[PDB]
Design a protein around this ligand. Structure first.
Ligand SMILES: [Cl-]
Ligand code: NA
Length: 529
């Protein structure tokens, strides 16, 4: 009863709104700034042209061919490695806990931009320390925008071990965003066209700012020696795997609604180009604004703002005040951020819910219990994400961002998605199905990226990150305690360990000698419906 899309344009809009969002506008610039300015692009492009697009198209084609969600598609592909799908769900679940938290911040900012003057424009407020000095007079001191971000929006604690108290105002914004998400799940043209126009306006403002040449050179000129550190490689690879919403099961679920005779190859390539171009262009605006900040504050470009998940809330609000009538542009920018995040959250939550109901179609999608299940999932996610709303919750958010739905947890899955398809299931066998679906035999790029490039990249990044291990730090100053790093590793393992547990369970349930069990569990039941 897999209801196909009403039209191809519906699928295109759905995926386009799904995989563009806070990854392109918020996470990519923050990861690029955290690592080297230009050294982040080389691994980014290598993963994009070697693993990102191939894995994205692989997930889309698996969904379209099996006509099944994230979890149940692997049952038709390779029953033994079904746990990958489960792992994917776990990953997306963790993402749904913290991704929406970002929107809460934006929502708070959206409520702080209805004043006569922007709170972060000038110093001398109730939340401003005596060190806080106006940036124009910065000829020690802290920028008022950073002061507003840290002491008013966050009210940051000394560490993760001091959770402080629930803010009661970021919590309200998070509740509002979750209510919006639940009532949407329970115009797309405007919601997709407006963010690009606002991003173009921001790009023009950043480019015309004085001192932006230094920021652009910082963003574009790589540092070769930085590539000797595995952290930039793994960060760029996982940013590629996160910005495309792969290893989550959302892409497989979205593609499962496609018609069997549908040329997913061309659309997928065009959409991947669109997403990569959006990220690359937004980086130009962010780093030109950062270069202007460096010029006006008399400080290095690497010390202007926060290296953590706050660059988008420090650079863009700064550039807003430069535009005439800054209240209007602040409202527009935060509405754009809300739209992008809400679209991404809608797509991811819908994918998770449809995978879960595919897992138990008798009850979870009977018709009456689907709404109850969606409400329960939303409530559980809100209660879980309340741990990042507290004063010390930024450190928990950083732990979630670095370990959950990112890092080796993706590299673990992207390998097993490819190794099963490329070597166990068969590259040529899937190419025959893709020829039957899209009508023409594709080039060897997908086959030689699944077979060699992607598993090699994943295993090399994993091994080189483990060999030269650097503990996670917040804003390159805070040293997490041992238990915090252990909690982050537990978050990663919660999804990493689904693959072998399911293999063990399958080997124990199937009867007979070991060889017969393995042979029967490696046989695809039906590749196509
Ligand atoms: Cl990206
Ligand atoms: Na993206």
């Amino acid at each position: 009863q897999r209801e196909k899309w009403s039209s191809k344009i519906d699928f295109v809009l759905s995926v386009a709104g799904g995989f563009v969002g806070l990854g392109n506008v918020w996470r990519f610039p923050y990861l690029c700034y955290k690592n080297g300015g230009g050294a982040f692009l080389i691994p980014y492009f290598i993963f994009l042209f070697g693993s990102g697009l191939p894995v994205f198209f692989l997930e889309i084609i698996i969904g379209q061919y099996t006509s099944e969600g994230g979890i149940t598609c692997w049952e038709k592909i390779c029953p033994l490695f079904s746990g990958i799908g489960y792992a994917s769900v776990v990953i997306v679940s963790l993402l749904n806990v913290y991704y929406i938290v970002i929107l809460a911040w934006a929502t708070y900012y959206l409520f702080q931009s209805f004043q006569k003057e922007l709170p972060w424009a000038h110093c001398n407020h109730s939340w401003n320390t005596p060190h806080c000095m106006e940036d124009t007079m910065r000829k020690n001191f802290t920028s008022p925008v950073i002061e507003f971000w840290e002491r008013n929006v966050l009210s940051l604690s000394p560490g993760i071990d001091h959770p402080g108290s629930l803010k009661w105002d970021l919590a309200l914004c998070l509740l509002l965003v979750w209510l919006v998400c639940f009532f949407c799940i329970w115009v797309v043209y405007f919601t997709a066209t407006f963010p690009f126009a606002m991003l173009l306006v921001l790009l023009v403002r950043g480019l015309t700012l004085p001192g932006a040449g230094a920021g652009i050179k910082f963003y574009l000129y790589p540092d070769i020696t930085r590539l000797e550190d595995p952290q930039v490689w793994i960060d760029a690879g996982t940013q590629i795997f996160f910005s495309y919403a792969i290893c989550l099961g959302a892409m497989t679920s979205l593609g499962s609604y496609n018609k069997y005779k549908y040329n997913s190859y061309r659309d997928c390539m065009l959409l991947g180009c669109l997403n990569s171009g959006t990220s690359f262009v937004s980086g130009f605006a962010i780093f030109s604004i950062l270069g202007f900040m460096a010029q006006e504050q008399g400080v290095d470009i690497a010390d202007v703002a926060e290296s953590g998940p706050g660059l988008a809330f420090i650079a863009y609000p700064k550039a807003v005040t430069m535009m005439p009538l800054p209240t209007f542009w602040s409202i527009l920018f935060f509405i754009m951020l809300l739209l992008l995040g809400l679209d991404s959250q809608f797509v991811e939550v819908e994918g998770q819910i449809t995978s879960l109901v595919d897992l138990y179609p008798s009850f979870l999608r009977k018709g009456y219990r689907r709404e109850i299940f969606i409400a329960f999932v939303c409530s559980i996610s809100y209660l879980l994400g309340l741990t990042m709303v507290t004063e010390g919750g930024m450190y928990v958010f950083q732990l979630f961002d670095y370990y959950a739905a990112s890092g080796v947890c993706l590299l673990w899955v992207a390998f097993f998605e490819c190794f099963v398809i490329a070597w166990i299931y068969g590259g040529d066998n899937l190419y025959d199905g893709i020829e039957d679906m899209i009508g023409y035999r594709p080039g060897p790029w997908m086959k030689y990226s699944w077979a060699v490039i992607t598993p090699v990249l994943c295993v090399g990044c994993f091994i080189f990150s483990l060999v030269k291990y650097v503990p996670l730090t917040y804003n390159k100053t805070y040293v997490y305690p041992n238990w915090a790093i252990g909690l982050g590793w537990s978050l990663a393992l919660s999804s990493m360990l689904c693959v072998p547990l399911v293999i063990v369970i399958r080997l124990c349930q199937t009867e007979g000698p070991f060889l017969v069990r393995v042979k029967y569990l490696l046989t695809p039941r039906e590749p196509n419906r």
